[PDB]
Amino acid sequence: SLQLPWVEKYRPQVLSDIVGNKETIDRLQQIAKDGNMPHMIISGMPGIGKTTSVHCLAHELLGRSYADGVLELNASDDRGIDVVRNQIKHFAQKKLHLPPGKHKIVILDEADSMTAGAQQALRRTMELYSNSTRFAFACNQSNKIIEPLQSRCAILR
Amino acid sequence: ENLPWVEKYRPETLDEVYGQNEVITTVRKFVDEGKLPHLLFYGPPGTGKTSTIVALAREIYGKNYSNMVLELNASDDRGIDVVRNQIKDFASTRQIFSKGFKLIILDEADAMTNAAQNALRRVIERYTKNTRFCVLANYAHKLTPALLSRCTRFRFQP
Amino acid sequence: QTIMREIAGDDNSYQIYEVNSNMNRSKKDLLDILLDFTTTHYVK
Amino acid sequence: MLEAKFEEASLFKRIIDGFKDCVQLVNFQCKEDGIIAQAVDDSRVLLVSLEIGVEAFQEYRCDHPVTLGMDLTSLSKILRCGNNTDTLTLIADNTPDSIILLFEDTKKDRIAEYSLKLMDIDADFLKIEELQYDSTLSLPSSEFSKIVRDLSQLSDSINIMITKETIKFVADGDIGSGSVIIKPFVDMEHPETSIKLEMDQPVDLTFGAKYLLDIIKGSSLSDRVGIRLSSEAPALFQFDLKSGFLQFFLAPKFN
Amino acid sequence: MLEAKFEEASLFKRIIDGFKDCVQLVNFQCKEDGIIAQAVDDSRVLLVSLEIGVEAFQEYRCDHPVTLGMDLTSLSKILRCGNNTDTLTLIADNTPDSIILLFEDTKKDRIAEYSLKLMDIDADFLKIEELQYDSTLSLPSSEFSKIVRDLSQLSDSINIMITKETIKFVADGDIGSGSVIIKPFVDMEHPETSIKLEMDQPVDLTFGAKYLLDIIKGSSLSDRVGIRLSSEAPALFQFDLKSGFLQFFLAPKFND
Amino acid sequence: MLEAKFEEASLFKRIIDGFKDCVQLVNFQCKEDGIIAQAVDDSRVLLVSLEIGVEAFQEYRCDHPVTLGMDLTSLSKILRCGNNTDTLTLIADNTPDSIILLFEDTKKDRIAEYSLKLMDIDADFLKIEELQYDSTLSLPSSEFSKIVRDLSQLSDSINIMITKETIKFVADGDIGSGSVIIKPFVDMEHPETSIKLEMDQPVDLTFGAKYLLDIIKGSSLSDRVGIRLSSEAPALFQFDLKSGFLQFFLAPKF
Numbered sequence A: 001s002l003q004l005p006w007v008e009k010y011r012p013q014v015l016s017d018i019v020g021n022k023e024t025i026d027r028l029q030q031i032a033k034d035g036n037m038p039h040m041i042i043s044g045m046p047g048i049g050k051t052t053s054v055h056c057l058a059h060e061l062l063g064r065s066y067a068d069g070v071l072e073l074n075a076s077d078d079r080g081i082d083v084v085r086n087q088i089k090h091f092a093q094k095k096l097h098l099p100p101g102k103h104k105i106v107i108l109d110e111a112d113s114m115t116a117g118a119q120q121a122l123r124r125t126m127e128l129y130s131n132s133t134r135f136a137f138a139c140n141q142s143n144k145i146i147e148p149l150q151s152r153c154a155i156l157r
Numbered sequence B: 001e002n003l004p005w006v007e008k009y010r011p012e013t014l015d016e017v018y019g020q021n022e023v024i025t026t027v028r029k030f031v032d033e034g035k036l037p038h039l040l041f042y043g044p045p046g047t048g049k050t051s052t053i054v055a056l057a058r059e060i061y062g063k064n065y066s067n068m069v070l071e072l073n074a075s076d077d078r079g080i081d082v083v084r085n086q087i088k089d090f091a092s093t094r095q096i097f098s099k100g101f102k103l104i105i106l107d108e109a110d111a112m113t114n115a116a117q118n119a120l121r122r123v124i125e126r127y128t129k130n131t132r133f134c135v136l137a138n139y140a141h142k143l144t145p146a147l148l149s150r151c152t153r154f155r156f157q158p
Numbered sequence C: 001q002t003i004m005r006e007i008a009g010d011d012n013s014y015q016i017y018e019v020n021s022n023m024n025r026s027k028k029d030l031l032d033i034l035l036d037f038t039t040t041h042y043v044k
Numbered sequence D: 001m002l003e004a005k006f007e008e009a010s011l012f013k014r015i016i017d018g019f020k021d022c023v024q025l026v027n028f029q030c031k032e033d034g035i036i037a038q039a040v041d042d043s044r045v046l047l048v049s050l051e052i053g054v055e056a057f058q059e060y061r062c063d064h065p066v067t068l069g070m071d072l073t074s075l076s077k078i079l080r081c082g083n084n085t086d087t088l089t090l091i092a093d094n095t096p097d098s099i100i101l102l103f104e105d106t107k108k109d110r111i112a113e114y115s116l117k118l119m120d121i122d123a124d125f126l127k128i129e130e131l132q133y134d135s136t137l138s139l140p141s142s143e144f145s146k147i148v149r150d151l152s153q154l155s156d157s158i159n160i161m162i163t164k165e166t167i168k169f170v171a172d173g174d175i176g177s178g179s180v181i182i183k184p185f186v187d188m189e190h191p192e193t194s195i196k197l198e199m200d201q202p203v204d205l206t207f208g209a210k211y212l213l214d215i216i217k218g219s220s221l222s223d224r225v226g227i228r229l230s231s232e233a234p235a236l237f238q239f240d241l242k243s244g245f246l247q248f249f250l251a252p253k254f255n
Numbered sequence E: 001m002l003e004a005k006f007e008e009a010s011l012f013k014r015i016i017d018g019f020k021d022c023v024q025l026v027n028f029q030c031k032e033d034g035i036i037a038q039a040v041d042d043s044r045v046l047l048v049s050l051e052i053g054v055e056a057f058q059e060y061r062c063d064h065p066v067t068l069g070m071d072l073t074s075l076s077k078i079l080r081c082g083n084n085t086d087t088l089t090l091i092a093d094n095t096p097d098s099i100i101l102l103f104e105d106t107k108k109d110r111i112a113e114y115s116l117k118l119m120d121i122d123a124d125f126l127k128i129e130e131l132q133y134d135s136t137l138s139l140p141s142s143e144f145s146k147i148v149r150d151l152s153q154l155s156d157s158i159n160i161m162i163t164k165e166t167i168k169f170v171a172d173g174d175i176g177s178g179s180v181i182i183k184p185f186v187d188m189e190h191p192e193t194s195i196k197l198e199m200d201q202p203v204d205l206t207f208g209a210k211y212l213l214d215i216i217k218g219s220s221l222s223d224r225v226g227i228r229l230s231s232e233a234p235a236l237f238q239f240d241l242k243s244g245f246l247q248f249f250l251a252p253k254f255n256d
Numbered sequence F: 001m002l003e004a005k006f007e008e009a010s011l012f013k014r015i016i017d018g019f020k021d022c023v024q025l026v027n028f029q030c031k032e033d034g035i036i037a038q039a040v041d042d043s044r045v046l047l048v049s050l051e052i053g054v055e056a057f058q059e060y061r062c063d064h065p066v067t068l069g070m071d072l073t074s075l076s077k078i079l080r081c082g083n084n085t086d087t088l089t090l091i092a093d094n095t096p097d098s099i100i101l102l103f104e105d106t107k108k109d110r111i112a113e114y115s116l117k118l119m120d121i122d123a124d125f126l127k128i129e130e131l132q133y134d135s136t137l138s139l140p141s142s143e144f145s146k147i148v149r150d151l152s153q154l155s156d157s158i159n160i161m162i163t164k165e166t167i168k169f170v171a172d173g174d175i176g177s178g179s180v181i182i183k184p185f186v187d188m189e190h191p192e193t194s195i196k197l198e199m200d201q202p203v204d205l206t207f208g209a210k211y212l213l214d215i216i217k218g219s220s221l222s223d224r225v226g227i228r229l230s231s232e233a234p235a236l237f238q239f240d241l242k243s244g245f246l247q248f249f250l251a252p253k254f
């Protein structure tokens, strides 16, 4: 049949097992423990543990509400202007009850491939719906994201 | 007959692929064991990457080869959106099949862009269980390292 | 918004139709709505 | 935690079709006395507030009050599945996440259960008070709907004349003018077709034709519509019901 | 050479109603026992197999096998001009190059013939790998079509679950969820609306909205539709006919 | 100056839509006996002629000939606003700069007025190129519309042969071929359907598929169509709707 690769078999399911960038990992652990997740753009070279880190952060923040509290937008699914205008807006407008301190999660992995217009429409729906949902970006190059998005996020290098 | 010899003398099985030995022995170990990960053939043109993989796919896929493989080309007149749609439709379908492990024959990946390669590796992530990918390229420096880390890298020498 | 809070004196007194880029700014989708908002009174 | 069973399937379909075309977001506020829903159009001109008593359901528990905020389009698409020969059951829970609609029938084998995810809406609650509006008349809904439909094609604005116990609708345009004048009367053969009127002061107001059409779209719930307007207060169009009422708050223009 | 005679002209229309959208090009294999046809879609997801018997023939002679390919769009374009009174008649010659269909009435001399060219694909295959199924169930086609169309607005995936002595349809989407459950009942007054079921193994496979909607649109072909469900195998959708049946192989969806 | 009230606006809509796809700009010279419209296509292959009698108008009081040049697309847009129970009245003054298309309803509460400017096209003369035709035939227009649409798919050129008193249409295509033959048949139970034929000289004419597709558009006017074919003169495709006349001329492609 098939054997599970050690890259996925031994993938850390918690933020503590992730090594490297001790300050940022500890701060993410503190955010997950307390709550009030900030908007951040995780940037850096590929294969250093950004997608795993953000997934573990979402796991530790939500728990059982992972399926209905996270909307993941990757390059495989379409991420055009209509996507941002309709499904991200509907997910932000969705009424999901969470314990205090937690918020809905919107993860856009490989955000460097986003079109300019989709990013331009993204800043307003993230500024207006910041009280219910929080966005998380993970891109290889931080220069491919326009300045307004960086002005509304704490860029993680 | 009156045809170019390039397609006339293709190796119908893995035994007629000469020159390359380590990769063929690894393929034989894989088929004997049964593990078929994601593969990546690259190197100078004419080393026989396409011939080796078509021999592999035919000797595994018997008669329903003509249905359950699909040979792709990144340089054709389709575009990134069309190739993405084709890959999703061929991977997320699970048609009338005797045995699974769908195979992707994607040639000439050196012309693929960064966003297209990221989409390809994301589709590889999502549909690993049912579909196996064997994207083919020629130069290893024209491919993003994220795509290299998700395929069994096999260099081809003259 | 701070000017509205100053002049109105209450948060609910003023009403702002804040137009963003997250919806469609097309003529056939918002023309009548904006004319209705700018023509008639607001229920309160 | 919610269990409201309508005696017929068509009632809720009609009452949600009454105000579907004007508003897109509706805020149900189910409590112990009954189900109450308020909605405001995207132009914040007309306010749709709906009240239904406990007598309109076969059973209704609602032990604790709860607010339900959902979209008109998805709800309508869900109800369009249900056959008219069914008994809708509205099921919800404390800290609402999704609303459950059960489509029961005499043939228990053919039964369907549906779910709809609620929408996070920040309701701007308003204090609706019975003010002393100057005019008060009640007229059959069909005649009002026909008059509004006829006068819509002539002008975008519809003007009313309420003076000396006379009902007149005014629509003036460049191509022509359209005026319909009918007088109050009481008919013993059919009291539902009678015209009633009670004034305190004369009123002259003008409202848009499209919003009037959206109001008359809901004329399928009652045979008669109560209109209460003031010289300075938002127009109130009340569609009476068997166990509740559906009222519309139309706002006047400027000067 | 080939004489295919239809007493009722609407039969061909209500047969090709399912073909007109599913597969772009199909070939008809005409044999002495009737006409058969098998087609595969562009994405190789749905396989459509058609069987016509001698019972639906006033007169028929097909002594030699015929390889007859055509376009379904042009077939329907010629077909919609047929009246409810005229009868049908398919005529072909040796090594056919253009199919001709004849319209003839009984009380008036109205002759309507039309020439249609043949499409060559050089692709013809017939296969029946496996036949037995874990579950047997049938239901009215109109009810099934209504259920599918009403459940299609919620999600693109429909899970046809068969629990013990019941049928369950599950569709979970972004705007909400939907669960339609129907139990097998026999209406002795009106047996057409009766639902019959026998169960051997549990059934928990899913499908797609668009292809199965393509399946349900052919409800005009038969008021009763036969449903075949089995684990680790594509479903079979059978529409009953007096001389044969039209069957579909719709692939499942990988779920884990 | 001009005041003609149509019996029904649907008749005007249908007669305008009959040749709407063929030509774009036409001239309407209206006289005592009626209104006549003639124009030529851009490719100089098609000739269009109109003639509407005065008995189809409820009231008609034109007292002097006048030419009315006006486009067809805006005319179609104007007539699309008409209703089933609305009559159309054409109004022109002594110095026509705009034409009023007034719509009148049974109830006097609905009045619709539409105005459009005049266009100045250099009007030609009645060809009178018509000469005796070798073959004349009549058949319901729906069957010829279906036959032309079916035959245009096979090839861009359609040949008409009336040899040995048999009406046959031939269109040899690159990837296919077709041949439909219709014999003269007369039906007594349904006078509406009939196949008449008169043969004087053999006919062999080939026309364009697009041209015939444009011709067959006006099938909503008359139940049956008369066809006149000549070896040298252009073919005469006349629609007889019993209120007015519509004839189409097509130059054979050589």
Ligand SMILES: Nc1ncnc2c1ncn2[C@@H]1O[C@H](COP(=O)(O)OP(=O)(O)OP(O)(O)=S)[C@@H](O)[C@H]1O
Residues within 6 Å of the ligand: A007, A008, A010, A011, A012, A017, A018, A019, A020, A045, A046, A047, A048, A049, A050, A051, A052, A053, A110, A140, B146
């Ligand atoms: N510091 C780390 N500790 C443990 N595992 C790690 C660490 N960094 C990376 N990994 C693993 O290495 C693999 C890399 O996966 P990803 O986190 O998706 O890579 P990435 O850093 O997001 O960059 P990409 O995916 O190429 S854009 C995963 O299996 C991770 O679990």
Ligand SMILES: Nc1ncnc2c1ncn2[C@@H]1O[C@H](COP(=O)(O)OP(=O)(O)OP(O)(O)=S)[C@@H](O)[C@H]1O
Residues within 6 Å of the ligand: B005, B006, B007, B008, B009, B010, B011, B016, B017, B018, B019, B020, B044, B045, B046, B047, B048, B049, B050, B051, B052, B138
């Ligand atoms: N080791 C080999 N043994 C036998 N024939 C070979 C071998 N390598 C290449 N060939 C033949 O050489 C030709 C090259 O065909 P391909 O394998 O398609 O070329 P390629 O190596 O895939 O490189 P490209 O330019 O990317 S198609 C074919 O006719 C092969 O049969």
Ligand SMILES: [Mg+2]
Residues within 6 Å of the ligand: A050, A051, A109, A110, A138
């Ligand atoms: Mg990543």
Ligand SMILES: [Mg+2]
Residues within 6 Å of the ligand: B050, B107
């Ligand atoms: Mg190659």
